[PDB]
Design a protein around this ligand. Sequence first.
Ligand code: HEM
Ligand SMILES: CSc1ccc(C(=O)O)cc1
Length: 393
Amino acid sequence: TIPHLAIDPFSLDFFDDPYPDQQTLRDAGPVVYLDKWNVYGVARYAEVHAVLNDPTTFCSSRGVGLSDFKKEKPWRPPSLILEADPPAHTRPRAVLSKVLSPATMKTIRDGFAAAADAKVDELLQRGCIDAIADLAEAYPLSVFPDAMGLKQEGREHLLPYAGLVANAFGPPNELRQTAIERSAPHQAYVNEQCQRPNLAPGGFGACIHAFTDTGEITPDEAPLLVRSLLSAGLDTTVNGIGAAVYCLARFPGELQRLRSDPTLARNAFEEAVRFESPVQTFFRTTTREVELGGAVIGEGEKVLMFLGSANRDPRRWSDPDLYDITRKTSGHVGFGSGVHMCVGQLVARLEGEVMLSALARKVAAIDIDGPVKRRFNNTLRGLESLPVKLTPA
Ligand code: HEM
Ligand SMILES: CSc1ccc(C(=O)O)cc1
């Protein structure tokens, strides 16, 4: 009944060009079985959205990766927020929701905006730059670690740690085994910068530890909640901003519309989030025998969600392969959906908006003038280098 496919969604050939295989996964049926890793797969928008909004049946406490926490021990202590189910997930979620609240973005927006308005000017003085290293990475690194309240020493560990966390959700391929092999130095620093004495007052991490008084989390739970933002608060914004620049580089008509109306910058970033989906996949584990798409999945089965394929499903989106800064992006699962929907989506949209805003007001053209190289990861889509030449407006 369920179609079986040998497609490896975690191979380098799949990362180079996932779109042909993602249509094969979508059109093969609402639910597929991937013989390479013995998992169920959903690639259409409807099933991916239904799985995300059914946390009781498709839980996350047994791991959002391939590995079953009930069968294998996790490579690191489980996330109190990402790898937990209600009700144990609720209160750590509420703390991170208030630390990254709408009232919090007001205190950092101008600093977020001025730094974006300072980087575009710096890169315009150089002309030919790398949109990944000198923009997609340089801008969030100049903004997010300080907003977290981080020290300056050892800051070159976060991006290797962030890339390793996303790589560990994948199967035991080389990408995962090579990552975890180079882990202990990155883990030691990250865990070190989760303790209360190492967080600057007023930063995100200090606010998390302040939320131990409220009784929603204990002091022993705050370092893990700080570790969640150190694992997820940087590299997805890097790939998200690096996606918008690439999309504006190959869709020059969309760049010119953004120039004429800079207020489209926020939705232009939301469109780049749907179009590229910096988080490609995430797992769930069936807590019961469940029927989905005419397929009866047993208990304790890993179900793979293709968030990028769901953001390009023609059953839900018109012209899903086109970058449209005026598209009604509401409903896309680039940030997830349900009780686990990205708690730091306001921080990511703030960084993406003010950067596309600075580009909309100061850049006239973005021309790719160098070899474009992709960055391979089991969970994250993103470019290693994007050599572009910026024309000042
Ligand atoms: C373009 C930027 C980003 C993208 C595409 C993204 C993507 C996602 C997705 C798809 C999920 C759902 C995970 C799941 O349902 O299993 C998620 C959750 C999460 N994200 Fe993000 N994220 C981004 C930025 C951020 C930022 C800036 C932060 C923190 C400052 C962050 C922290 C988290 C955390 C802690 C969770 C777990 C929420 C929960 O389990 O309830 N992410 N993210
Ligand atoms: C790649 S999305 C993500 C990664 C890690 C965490 C966490 O550390 O809790 C949350 C979201």
